[PDB]
């Protein structure tokens, strides 16, 4: 959260870049199927999808 770092700026100089920032928990995200026991193990699903990711 509290950043304390040294950026080089070449050899002759330095920057003690130093900030505070708000904490972000980023969970894990997953794309999975239903788990359905078949006579043999799980049913197998395969999804046709379009992810759309813009930043």
């Amino acid at each position: 959260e509290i950043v304390i770092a040294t950026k080089a700026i070449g050899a002759n100089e330095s920057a003690l870049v130093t900030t505070i920032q708000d904490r972000r928990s980023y969970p894990r995200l997953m794309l999975s199927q239903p788990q359905i026991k078949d006579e043999t193990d799980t049913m197998k699903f395969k999804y046709q999808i379009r992810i759309s990711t813009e930043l």
Partner: peptide, 21 residues
Amino acid sequence: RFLKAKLCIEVYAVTRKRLIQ
């Protein structure tokens, strides 16, 4: 700065493999 990141999934199909045994 990364200002905002929006993800949108679109599901065109849900397709299981039907296993007849």
